[PDB]
Design a protein around this ligand. Structure first.
Ligand SMILES: [Ca+2]
Ligand SMILES: [Cl-]
Length: 488
């Protein structure tokens, strides 16, 4: 029997259900041979940022995917096999842990999977058997790896969230710094530094985080829209609502569906990687795919994406099949649909111009709807900052990735974009020192601890953009159906 990975089905899905201007990304380069007119994103500086997302948890894992115009993020269960690399590249583990020190010793297995085989979990190839033992009025998890038995730091069974401590030691006496997650069909064995990583959450639906509320927020930013085999396609919503409360007969109640009529709602907002600024809230009433009313319900001048707070609104919802909550604010749209030229010449679309340069810049960009855009030149620095070790060459070093973006210069106000391809022509001036200036700043701040991994200079179209925060089904509005005998 063939092993279906899920990839063939997932790409087919993406091709049939998403805009031709949508951006998908992934760890693995499946699909590299697919031909497009698109010079945009369908998936090595960005590797550190992908890994930063996947290998980490909480605040530091909040990467600004919006600046990439990211639409879909593909999670592949088989990436456990690449997880040391991802952990290393994302700053979760040291070089030593990643693949051994200079004597090939000390390497760590970040993620191992076991298959449920009734009451017990196995991986033949790794010679692993995980089982629950009952001894001394109590439960414990035993991980057997060859002849030695091992006690995980912590184990958590799902469904349940049933926590159960252990020693973090083997019968050997030797350390066992692993966490176990038991699900109905998988047993995940994770090294402690990556036990609550986002990959573990999204690959295996484990709702754990070292941080309070973080798993719940994450799941509103990444919506499973399709799955097959070992592939889950998540839609990215940078601004999302993870919990709504209706104020009902004097107390707040968590709600699923909403009835038409007046409501007072408390919206719990998760902002992922970027702040809310000068934002308007809406509700769009929808019948199927038709939008029948747009209602402004609020504004948010500013919310910090690391310290978000609930928002109270009052709304009269008309009758409709479902309600879509929208956040509108400034952000990027447009995918490059042909090559980019400076002064007649084809240039790199990731490095449009060097500091000091000048000239006619020619872009062709595709958008899904009409907008009025401003065009900027935007810089992106992806770099590493050594944490630990006494040198970039020391094996006890880990490297923490960073991504800073800033707008270098505005090139044009009030471009009218049209659904489909748009040809754009403008005069462009790179200030000398735009890049070097920032490079020096980082150098001065971090010293030898700094490794720059990528610098980009990119054209970016800024518009009032609509973001989908959540979709809520309407409830039936009342309240025998013999009315239809001998009808039609
Ligand atoms: Ca956040
Ligand atoms: Cl941006």
């Amino acid at each position: 029997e063939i092993e279906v990975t899920g990839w063939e089905q997932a790409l087919k899905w993406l091709r049939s259900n998403t805009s031709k201007y949508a951006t998908a990304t992934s760890w693995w380069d499946y699909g590299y041979w697919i031909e497009s007119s698109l010079l945009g994103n369908r998936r090595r500086d960005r590797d550190h940022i992908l890994a930063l997302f996947l290998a980490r948890d909480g605040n530091i894992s909040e990467v600004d995917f919006e600046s990439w115009e990211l639409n879909y993020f593909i999670i592949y269960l088989n990436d456990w096999a690449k997880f040391n690399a991802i952990s290393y590249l994302g700053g979760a583990i040291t070089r030593k842990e990643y693949n051994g020190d200079e004597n090939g010793r000390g390497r760590v297995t970040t993620i191992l999977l076991t298959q449920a085989a009734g009451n017990v979990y196995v991986n033949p190839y790794a010679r692993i058997v995980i089982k629950v033992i009952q001894q001394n009025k109590t439960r414990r998890i035993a991980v057997n790896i060859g002849q030695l038995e091992c006690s995980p730091i912590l184990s958590v069974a799902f469904p349940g969230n049933i926590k159960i401590k252990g020693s973090g030691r083997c019968s050997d006496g030797s350390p066992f710094p692993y966490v176990v997650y038991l699900t109905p069909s998988l047993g995940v064995l994770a090294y402690y530094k990556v036990a609550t990583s986002n990959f573990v959450k999204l690959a295996f639906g484990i709702p754990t985080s070292s941080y309070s509320e973080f798993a719940e927020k994450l799941f509103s930013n990444f919506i499973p829209v399709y799955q097959y085999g070992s592939v889950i396609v998540y839609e990215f919503r940078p601004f999302a609502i993870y919990k709504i409360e209706d104020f009902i007969n004097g107390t707040w109640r968590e709600v699923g569906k909403l009835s038409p009529g007046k409501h007072t709602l408390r919206l719990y907002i998760s902002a992922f990687g970027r702040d809310i600024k000068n934002a308007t809230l809406y509700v769009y009433a929808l019948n199927g795919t038709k939008i029948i009313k747009r209602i402004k319900v609020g504004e948010i001048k500013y919310m910090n994406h690391l310290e978000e707070y609930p928002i109270i609104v009052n709304v009269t919802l008309p009758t409709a099949q479902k309600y879509r909550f929208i956040l509108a604010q400034k952000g990027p749209v447009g995918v490059l649909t042909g090559p980019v030229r400076v002064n007649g010449k084809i240039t790199n679309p990731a490095y449009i111009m060097r500091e000091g340069e000048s000239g006619r810049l020619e872009l062709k960009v595709g958008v899904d709807k009409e907008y009025t855009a401003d065009l900027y030149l935007r810089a992106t620095f992806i770099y590493l900052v050594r944490k630990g070790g006494k040198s970039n060459e020391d094996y006890d070093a880990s490297f923490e990735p960073h991504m800073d973006t800033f707008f270098i210069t505005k090139l044009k106000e009030g471009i009218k974009l049209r659904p489909g391809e748009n040809e754009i022509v403008v005069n462009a001036e790179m200030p000398k020192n735009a890049i070097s200036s920032y490079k020096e700043k980082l150098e001065k701040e971090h010293g030898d601890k700094l490794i720059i991994r990528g610098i980009r200079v990119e054209p970016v179209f800024i518009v009032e953009k609509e973001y989908t925060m959540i979709e809520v089904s309407a409830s039936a509005p009342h309240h025998h159906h013999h009315h239809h005998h001998h009808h039609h």
